[PDB]
RNA sequence: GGGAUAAGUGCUGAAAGCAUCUAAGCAUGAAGCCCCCCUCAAGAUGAGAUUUCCCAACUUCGGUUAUAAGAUCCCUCAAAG
RNA sequence: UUGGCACCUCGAUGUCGGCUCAUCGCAUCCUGGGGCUGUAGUCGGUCCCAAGGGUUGGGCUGUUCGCCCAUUAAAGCGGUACGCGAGCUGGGUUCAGAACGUCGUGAGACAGUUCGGUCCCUAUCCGUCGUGGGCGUAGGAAAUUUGAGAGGAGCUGUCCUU
RNA sequence: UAUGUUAAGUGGAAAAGGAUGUGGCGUUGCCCAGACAACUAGGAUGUUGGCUUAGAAGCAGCCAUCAUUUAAAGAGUGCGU
């Protein structure tokens, strides 16, 4: 799980979604995973 | 009780005359020792040719007391002396004549080697 | 479960099974009578009250806690006894169980239960920094003025105060103690005590409580 | 809301009583009986449900295709049933019952035991097998992630409690 | 050993007929939170509760003696100081 | 932290280390929970949640620091007048003596060394640790009490088994 | 009082940057011939042809990237070495 003020999608299949006030990134690879920003 | 700076003979024929203790090992803050428990050591005197020899820094185990010890049916064993001998880091000693008696509170240590190559198990 | 009153008379040693050293607190626990049955739409709790001892019948013209007064007589009549000494209650036994005005033996206690005993300490008086606080004291040479006195007692303008609970000197002991997790080696039914292993707080001759472990 | 409005409902030999808010549904395998959303309103024809928003603020276009799709749920479930279906892949790894709860042995020094409840059934395949089955579909869920969670899937060799057909990420790390 | 949680893990689930831990709801999850365990605690001026004991007789009207029940003075003491 | 500013204090706010006693933050050293990994488990690395507790004994210097020798699960970083001298020491530094090197023609000088060099105070108030008396709790009393709150604990190793 | 805005206790401390948070005003390319979803409908051909590179035929790199079996098709939009 990456947390850094910059979650921006990493590959085509990585999605943006709104989870209890935080945008996360939400990826088949699990790498890819992002939290705060 | 022994603590560190506290000088011991030893009691084996591996070659040091008598030694001193730097650490008790088994815990942090761990103060004091007696019959049953290791330290570390460095030999003061050492005889002419051993194997171990003198200035060395050495794993031991402490044998005969003289604080003594309680045994469980209110019976106390004391002796007139400390009192240690060396170790290889596997319980087993590096002489092989040891000399003096040892109690019999090293047999569940599994110091067996120290308790069968002794003169009296006490 | 189980509760009763003692007061302590010493401590001996006890070779158990197997030759072991067990190390015991006699404990006399005579005449434990039940004086009430608390109830919980009665009083709000549900217990009961144990008195121990025997204090001498009421008197005119008594000096002394020796004899009862007539408020105590009123109270220990009511279950048909004589005026006690000491009066507790317990609420970890169930009041079913019990019934107003009967005896707590001894026997109550079987070999070998987990009890907790509850007493008062002994009183050490005023006592210093280090006897009461177990403090470190400072060098007793090399020129030092400071030799049993608490150190520091604050920082300096931030807190220009000495906070809460700072460790000075006072007066020892007199505090209910609890040691937990005790056992009884025998109990005896014609002399009337039960031997606790271990040590209990107290002077000799004082009042311990002693009931089934809460853990 | 197309969930919502455009997908009507179909009631298949069941019962749906809508009252008031508090829904009930009665069928072949038993009754749930759930508390939808207020404002939404339901207009019952033979045979076919339709639920209704009463605006289309976001927040009337989002809680209506949310309980519409809860509503099928329900029906689909009194009638069809919910089952969930996981396997146990490893040397040793069984499964067995014991009346009402199932015995799981993973590789744990320990047996795990997943106590039954109530609506819900569980049964075993080859030892293998598991299956959860039940009318509620968030229970068949919430069960099934329970027996999942004694010991998931791990990527080296595969073996642990997995879906019946769920993509495990296979890693090849080597001795 | 309970109860509520943190990062996290989910279940059902739409906005956005797909998805999706989320918005409704409902799960799980830490030496952390609350209880649990020890001690002090009704000056808790909100001053709480239970049992018992004491209960008259002058007033000229109590702004009333002295006495109950209970203590203390004083004295022998220590398990307390 | 090294500074810049000169705003309170020169009818005096004792300045450095150590000792005694701590207390608080968390950007966490260990312990607990997790996402991960170029993680097969032990291994390590990274990030997140976490401050409840714990977070050694020595050799060398006045030293803080740092290095070294043994341990530990770890030997955390900071605030607190670089916490705390009306609680302690006084080794360093900063008076008068002396001496060496250097500068000065000289008296003398150097934050260059070196040996020596007086640490006062009976606690009024607030504060804090204990311990009494008075009064109030719609009568006067003896005993047993619930608990609104408050405080204390809170750490963790190795071995065996599977 | 009227009409609107926020959902963070924003109001009631920062910034570069990050974001399917939400409201307004335009501009716009597409759409009942039916764009946009997963619409679970086909997905490959001589053919990696040529340099074919560790052999590697959507990956170590020049791509020469020909028409369609076809309602819809690319010497493969693409996840891969
Ligand atoms: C016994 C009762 C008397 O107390 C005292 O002597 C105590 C001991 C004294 O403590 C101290 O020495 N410092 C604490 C120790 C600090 O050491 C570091 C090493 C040094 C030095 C040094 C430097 C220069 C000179 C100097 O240059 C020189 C010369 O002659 O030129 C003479 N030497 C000796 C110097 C030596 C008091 C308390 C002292 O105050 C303190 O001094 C400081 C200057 C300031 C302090 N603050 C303001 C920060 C202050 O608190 C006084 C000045 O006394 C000398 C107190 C005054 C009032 C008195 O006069 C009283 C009446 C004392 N006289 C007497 O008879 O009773 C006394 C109470
Ligand atoms: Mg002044």
Redesign the pocket.
């Given at each position: 799980?990456?947390?850094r003020?910059?979650?921006?999608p990493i590959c085509?299949k990585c999605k943006?979604?709104?989870?209890?006030?935080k945008?996360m990134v939400?990826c088949e690879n699990?790498?890819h995973?992002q939290?705060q920003? | 009780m022994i603590q560190?700076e506290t000088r011991l003979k030893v009691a084996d024929n591996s070659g040091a005359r008598e030694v001193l203790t730097?650490?008790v090992?088994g815990?942090?803050?761990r103060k004091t020792a007696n019959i049953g428990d290791v330290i570390?050591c460095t030999v003061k005197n050492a005889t002419p040719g051993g194997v171990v020899k003198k200035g060395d820094?050495v794993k031991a185990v402490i044998v005969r007391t003289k604080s003594g010890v309680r045994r469980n049916d209110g019976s106390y064993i004391k002796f007139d002396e400390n009192a240690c001998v060396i170790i290889r880091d596997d319980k087993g000693p590096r002489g092989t004549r040891i000399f003096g008696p040892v109690a019999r509170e090293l047999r569940e240590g599994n110091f067996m080697k120290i308790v069968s190559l002794a003169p009296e198990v006490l | 479960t189980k509760g009763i009153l003692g007061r302590k008379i010493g401590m001996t040693q006890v070779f158990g099974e197997n030759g072991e050293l067990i190390p015991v607190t006699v404990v006399e626990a005579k005449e434990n009578v039940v004086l009430?049955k608390?109830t919980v739409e009665?009083?709000?709790?549900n217990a009961i009250?144990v008195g121990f001892e025997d204090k001498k019948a009421?008197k005119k013209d008594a000096?002394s806690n020796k004899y009862a007064?007539?408020?105590?007589e009123?109270?220990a009549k009511?279950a048909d006894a004589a005026p006690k000494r000491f009066?507790?209650?317990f609420?970890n036994v169930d009041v079913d169980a019990y019934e107003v005005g009967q005896e707590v033996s001894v026997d109550t206690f079987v070999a070998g239960d987990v009890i907790?005993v509850?007493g008062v300490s002994?009183?050490?008086?005023?006592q210093g920094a280090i006897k009461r606080h177990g403090?470190?004291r400072?060098?007793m040479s090399?020129?030092?003025?400071?030799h049993r006195?608490?150190?520091?007692?604050?920082?300096?303008?931030?807190?220009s105060?000495?906070?809460?609970?700072?460790?000075?000197?006072?007066?020892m002991?007199?505090?209910?103690?609890?040691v937990?997790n005790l056992e009884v080696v025998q109990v005896d039914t014609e002399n009337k005590v039960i031997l606790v292993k271990g040590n209990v707080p107290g002077?000799?001759?004082?009042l311990v409580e002693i009931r089934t472990s809460?853990? | 809301?197309?969930?919502?409005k455009?997908?009507i409902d179909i009631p298949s030999d069941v019962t749906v009583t809508f009252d008031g808010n508090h829904v009930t549904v009665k069928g072949p395998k038993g009754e749930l009986s759930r508390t939808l959303?207020e404002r939404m309103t339901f207009k019952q024809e033979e045979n076919t449900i339709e639920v209704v928003r009463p605006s289309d603020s976001?927040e009337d276009?989002?809680?209506?295709?949310?309980?519409r799709?809860?509503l099928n749920?329900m029906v689909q479930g009194v009638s069809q049933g919910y089952v969930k279906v996981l396997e146990l892949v490893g040397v040793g790894y069984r499964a067995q019952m014991q009346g009402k709860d199932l015995i799981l042995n993973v590789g744990y020094?320990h047996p795990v035991e997943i106590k039954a409840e109530e609506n819900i059934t569980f049964s075993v395949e080859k030892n293998t097998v598991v299956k959860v089955e039940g009318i509620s579909?968030?229970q068949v869920?919430?069960l099934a992630?329970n027996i999942r969670?004694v010991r998931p899937p791990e990527?080296?060799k595969g073996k642990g409690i997995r879906y019946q057909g769920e993509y495990v990420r296979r890693?090849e790390?080597?001795?």
């Open positions: 799980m990456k947390v003020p910059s979650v921006k085509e943006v979604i709104k989870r209890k006030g945008v939400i699990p790498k995973k939290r920003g | 560190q730097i650490k090992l815990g942090s803050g570390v820094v | 009430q608390k009665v009083d709000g709790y009250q009421y000096k007064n007539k408020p105590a009123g109270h009511k009066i507790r209650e609420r907790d509850t002994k009183g050490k008086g005023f403090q470190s400072g060098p090399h020129g030092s003025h400071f006195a608490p150190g520091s007692v604050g920082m300096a303008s931030d807190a105060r000495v906070f809460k609970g700072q460790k000075m000197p006072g007066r002991g007199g505090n209910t103690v609890t937990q002077p000799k001759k004082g809460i853990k | 809301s197309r969930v919502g455009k997908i959303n976001k276009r989002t809680n209506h295709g949310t309980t799709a809860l749920n020094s579909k968030e869920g919430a992630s969670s990527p080296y890693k790390g080597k001795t």
